[PDB]
Design a protein around this ligand. Structure first.
Ligand SMILES: Nc1ncnc2c1c(Cc1cccc3ccccc13)nn2CC1CCNCC1
Length: 448
C-alpha cells in the first residue's frame, strides 16, 4: 500500500514536529485529512520498526475528543506518512491573544480539556513528553471550540532535531526529569502545569534570556507567584499549580487526580457561579509572549528560507543552462516547466505573467529564475513582516534594543553577534530598528 495511490496533496499546512504537514484528500471519497511526512534521512528513529508499528496500530484504535485522531500509516524507502484528522482552528494561544477578556474560568476550561486528553492517553501508557502550546490545536478559531492535542507518542519513536527553528519555546515546558533522562507519564503533568501558569499570569514560571538560562531554571525547579497579577488569582488555582509543578515525579499529582482537583471542579461548571474578573495583565503578557515567540520563530524561518533560495537559484540556472543548447538564454514555457520539475506549472504561468504578459515568444530564463525565486520566498518574507507588525503592539514601527535581546535570545543568536551586525547595518542606530533594518540584520546573520 503506497500513500500516493490513496491521497493527493492539496496544500501545505505548516511544519510541525518531526516534519512537514500537508492537507491531503482521499482520491476516492474526497475526505480531507492532514498528513505528517517524516524523512527517515533527516529524522533518526529511536526504536525498532516493530515497536513503532505496534504503537501506531494502538493509536488507530484510540478515540478521545481532546486527542488528534490518527487514521493511517504509510512508509517508503525515504519517509513515514502519518495520516490523521485535520483541525482548522489554529493554535490555542493565537486565539487567546485576540480575546478582550480572559478569566480563571476560561483557563480552567482549557486545562480541563488538556487533562482529559492526557488522562486518557496515560491510561493507554502513551506519553507525550513535548506538550506545549503549539501542540494544542482548535477545531475552530473560537473560544468555544474543542482542543485537540497533537503529537502524543511521537517522542518515544523519533529523535528530536537540534535545529533552533524546530525547538522554539520547547525549554519553557519540558519537565526537569526529562532533562536528566529518567521520565514517565508524570512529565506531561509538569508541562500542563507550566501551561496553566502561563494562562493565569501571561509569563512562564521558568524564564530566561536564552535556551540554557531557561533550562537551568527548570532544572533547579524553583518558581514563585511573586508577580503582581497573581493577586487576582484564587489560592485554589495556585494549589493545583503547586501539585502539577512538584519536582519529584512520584510526588507529583497524576493527570487523573488533577481533573478531580477542587479548582477544576469549581471553575469548569457550565453555569458560572463564581467571580470572573478579566485577567487583564495576563492577556497583555500572553500577547507579548506569543508575539515574541512568533517573531523569533519567523526570524529563524526567514534566515532558513534565504539560504534555501540561494542554493535553489544556483541549481535552477545550472539546469536551464544545460537545457540551453542554443546558448541564447531563452527558453519556451515547456522547457521552463521541465526545468522547475527537474529542480525538485501554474507557478510558471504566474511568473510568465510578470515576465512576458503577451507571451509573444521565448523567455529570458535568467529573468525567470529571479521571479520564480524572488517570489517563492514571499510566504517567509511576508510572514516575517506580519510577525514584526504583530509584535509591535503600539504601532511604533520599531523594536527596542531590549526587545531585540529577548527576540535573539529566544532565537539563540549570540548577543555580541547581533550587535555587531546592527552596527554594520546602521552606525548611527539609537537602540532601535525598523522592519527593514531588522530584515537587514537577519540577512547578515545568515551570510548575506
Ligand atoms: N492535525 C493537524 N491539523 C491541522 N494542522 C496540523 C495538524 C498537525 C498534526 C498532525 C497532522 C497530520 C498527521 C499527524 C500525525 C501524528 C501527529 C500529528 C499529526 N500539524 N499541523 C500543522 C500545524 C501548523 C501550526 N503549528 C501547529 C501545527
Amino acid at each position: 500500500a503506497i500513500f500516493s495511490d490513496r491521497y493527493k496533496g492539496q496544500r501545505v499546512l505548516g511544519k510541525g514536529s518531526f516534519g512537514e504537514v500537508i492537507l491531503c484528500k482521499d482520491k476516492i471519497t474526497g475526505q480531507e485529512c492532514a498528513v505528517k511526512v517524516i524523512s527517515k534521512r533527516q529524522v533518526k528513529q529511536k526504536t525498532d520498526k516493530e515497536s513503532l508499528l505496534r504503537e501506531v496500530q494502538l493509536l488507530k484504535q484510540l478515540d478521545h475528543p481532546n486527542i488528534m485522531k490518527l487514521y493511517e500509516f504509510f512508509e517508503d524507502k525515504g519517509y513515514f506518512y502519518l495520516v490523521g484528522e485535520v483541525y482548522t482552528g489554529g493554535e490555542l494561544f493565537d486565539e487567546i491573544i485576540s480575546r478582550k477578556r480572559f478569566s480563571e474560568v476560561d483557563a480552567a476550561r482549557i486545562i480541563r480539556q488538556v487533562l482529559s486528553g492526557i488522562t486518557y492517553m496515560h491510561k493507554n501508557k502513551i506519553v507525550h513528553r513535548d506538550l506545549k502550546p503549539e501542540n494544542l490545536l482548535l477545531e475552530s478559531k473560537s473560544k468555544d471550540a474543542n482542543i485537540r492535542i497533537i503529537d502524543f507518542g511521537l517522542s518515544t519513536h523519533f529523535e528530536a532535531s537540534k535545529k533552533m527553528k524546530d525547538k522554539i519555546g520547547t525549554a519553557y515546558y519540558i519537565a526537569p526529569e526529562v532533562l536528566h533522562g529518567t521520565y514517565d507519564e508524570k512529565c506531561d503533568v509538569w508541562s500542563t502545569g507550566v501551561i496553566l501558569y502561563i494562562l493565569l499570569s501571561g509569563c512562564p514560571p521558568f524564564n530566561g534570556a536564552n535556551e540554557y538560562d531557561i533550562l537551568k531554571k527548570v532544572e533547579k525547579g524553583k518558581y514563585t507567584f511573586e508577580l503582581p497579577q497573581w493577586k487576582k488569582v484564587s489560592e485554589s488555582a495556585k494549589d493545583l499549580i503547586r501539585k502539577m509543578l512538584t519536582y519529584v515525579p512520584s510526588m507529583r499529582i497524576s493527570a487523573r487526580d488533577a481533573l478531580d482537583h477542587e479548582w477544576i471542579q469549581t471553575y469548569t461548571k457550565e453555569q458560572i457561579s463564581v467571580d470572573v474578573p478579566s485577567l487583564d495583565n495576563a492577556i497583555l503578557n500572553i500577547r507579548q509572549f506569543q508575539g515574541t515567540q512568533k517573531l523569533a520563530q519567523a526570524a529563524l524561518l526567514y534566515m532558513g528560507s534565504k539560504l534555501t533560495s540561494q542554493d535553489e537559484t544556483k541549481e535552477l540556472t545550472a539546469i536551464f543552462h544545460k537545457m540551453d543548447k542554443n546558448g541564447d538564454g531563452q527558453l519556451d514555457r515547456a522547457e521552463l516547466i521541465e526545468g522547475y520539475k527537474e529542480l525538485m506549472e501554474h507557478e510558471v504561468d504566474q511568473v510568465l505573467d510578470a515576465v512576458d504578459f503577451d507571451k509573444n515568444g521565448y523567455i529570458e530564463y535568467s529573468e525567470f529564475v529571479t521571479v520564480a525565486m524572488d517570489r517563492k520566498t514571499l510566504l517567509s518574507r511576508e510572514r516575517l513582516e506580519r510577525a514584526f507588525r504583530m509584535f509591535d503592539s503600539d504601532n511604533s514601527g520599531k523594536i527596542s534594543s531590549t526587545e531585540l535581546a529577548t527576540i535573539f535570545g529566544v532565537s539563540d543568536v549570540d548577543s555580541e553577534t547581533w550587535k555587531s551586525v546592527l552596527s554594520e547595518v546602521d552606525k548611527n542606530n539609537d537602540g532601535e530598528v525598523d522592519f527593514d533594518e531588522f530584515q537587514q540584520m537577519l540577512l547578515k546573520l545568515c551570510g548575506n
